[PDB]
Structures are given as structure tokens and as C-alpha cells.
Ligand binder design. Structure first.
Ligand SMILES: CCCCCCCCCO[C@@H]1O[C@H](CO)[C@@H](O)[C@H](O)[C@H]1O
Ligand SMILES: CCCCCCCCCO[C@@H]1O[C@H](CO)[C@@H](O)[C@H](O)[C@H]1O
Ligand SMILES: Cc1ncc(Cc2cccc(CCO)c2)c(N)n1
Length: 176
């Protein structure tokens, strides 16, 4: 209630704080560990809570000057649509015990995939001026964003697996 709103705000604040950590692997290839609090929020509280947490994270990135903004339409795609889209993991919420790892991992996979699909589309339209010598716009965006998405999923997998084994109730909301 009040509690749902606090959880959302705190996880979005957490994602933003985490996003301040340097995460560059090479060029524009990143490991986006900042997705994890939004993933966890979504898995615990469902689609709407996740969408809104993603929204708040994106707005925070932009208004603090930490987003890479090339245009209104690009920033809309990459810092509203993209982070919001992590909320899709919410469709994999488990409401009842025992907690299973399967929906956690499938939901993480589908949500990181969806986010980076939007970054991949953005990459084609707005970032092709950076494409490695000899690479076309699509192939360059596929490699940058394909690799970033996989790496981000790897990291999300590692952390959430630990969280499932050690703190499975992070994932299951209860009153009481
Ligand atoms: C519906 C649009 C709302 C417009 C205002 C944008 C930010 C909304 C919440 O702001 C704050 O973000 C801080 C980040 O650290 C948190 O510490 C704090 O808990 C939270 O309250
Ligand atoms: C790129 C967009 C991806 C679309 C995502 C489709 C989400 C469908 C989620 O299904 C749910 O999965 C749960 C756990 O696996 C099942 O317990 C439950 O029966 C089922 O309702
Ligand atoms: C080729 C290419 N280069 C840069 C970007 C911009 C970008 C990529 C992934 C994630 C973010 C947001 C969090 O930082 C931004 C892009 N989409 N495609």
C-alpha cells in the first residue's frame, strides 16, 4: 500500500545509485547491474510495480545528467521505454511458496532481452555513427547490445541465483 509505494521508490533509487558504478566492458558494451533492483521489484510485486520502478529509474537517470541523450525520441526509447520494460519480469511473479528458481531466471532473461531489444533498435537509428570500421548499423548495434544484454543477464543471473538460495523471501510478498 504505503508499503508498496515505498518498495517501488526504494528499488528505483537503488537502481539509480547502482547505475553510478562504472560498468563499461569495452566502448559502449556494458554490464548493466543497475537492472537488478528493478528485476527484483518486478519479480516480487508484479508487472505494474516493475513498470513504475523502471519509469522512476529512467527519469532519475535523465534529470541527474547521467543519461546519454541524443534526442527527445532517443531518450524516450532508451530511458523511459527501455527501463520500464524490465517490468515484464513481473509476469513471472511467484505469489506462493516454495520459491522456484525457474520463473526467476526465465523472467530475468525475457526482461533483459526486452530492454536490450529496445537498446538494439536505438543503436540502429541513433548510434550508427560510432559503428566500428567495416560494420553496418544493424550488425554493430546487434553486437554492442546483444553482448551487453547477455553480460547483463549473466550478472543478473549470478546475483539473483544467490538471492534465491540465500533470501528466497525477497521474491515472495506477504502482508503480516
Ligand atoms: C510521479 C512522478 C514523481 C516526480 C518526482 C520524481 C522522483 C519521485 C520520488 O523521489 C524520490 O526519489 C529519491 C531518489 O533517491 C528517493 O530517495 C525517494 O524515496 C523518492 O521519494
Ligand atoms: C519479449 C516479451 C516477453 C513476453 C513475456 C510473456 C510472459 C508470460 C508469463 O507466463 C507466466 O509464467 C509463469 C512462470 O513461468 C507461469 O507460472 C504462469 O502460468 C504464466 O502465466
Ligand atoms: C550501439 C549503441 N551504442 C550506445 C547505445 C546507448 C545505450 C546502450 C545500452 C544501454 C543504454 C542505457 C543505460 O546506460 C544506452 C545504444 N543503444 N546502442
Amino acid at each position: 500500500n504505503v508499503r508498496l509505494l515505498t518498495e517501488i521508490a526504494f528499488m528505483a533509487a537503488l537502481a539509480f545509485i547502482i547505475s553510478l558504478i562504472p560498468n563499461t566492458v569495452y566502448g559502449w558494451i556494458i554490464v548493466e547491474i543497475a537492472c537488478i533492483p528493478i528485476l527484483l521489484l518486478s519479480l516480487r510485486r508484479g508487472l505494474t510495480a516493475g513498470l513504475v520502478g523502471g519509469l522512476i529509474w529512467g527519469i532519475l537517470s535523465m534529470i541527474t545528467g547521467h543519461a546519454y541523450i541524443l534526442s527527445l525520441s532517443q531518450a524516450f526509447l532508451e530511458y523511459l521505454v527501455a527501463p520500464v520494460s524490465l517490468g515484464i519480469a513481473g509476469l513471472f511473479r511467484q505469489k506462493t511458496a516454495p520459491l522456484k528458481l525457474a520463473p526467476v531466471l526465465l523472467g530475468t532473461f525475457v526482461a533483459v532481452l526486452l530492454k536490450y531489444f529496445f537498446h538494439f533498435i536505438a543503436g540502429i537509428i541513433f548510434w550508427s555513427q560510432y559503428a566500428w570500421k567495416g560494420w553496418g548499423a544493424v550488425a554493430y548495434s546487434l553486437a554492442v547490445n546483444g553482448i551487453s544484454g547477455i553480460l547483463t543477464a549473466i550478472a543478473a543471473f549470478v546475483i539473483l541465483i544467490i538471492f534465491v538460495k540465500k533470501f528466497p523471501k525477497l521474491f515472495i510478498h506477504s502482508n503480516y
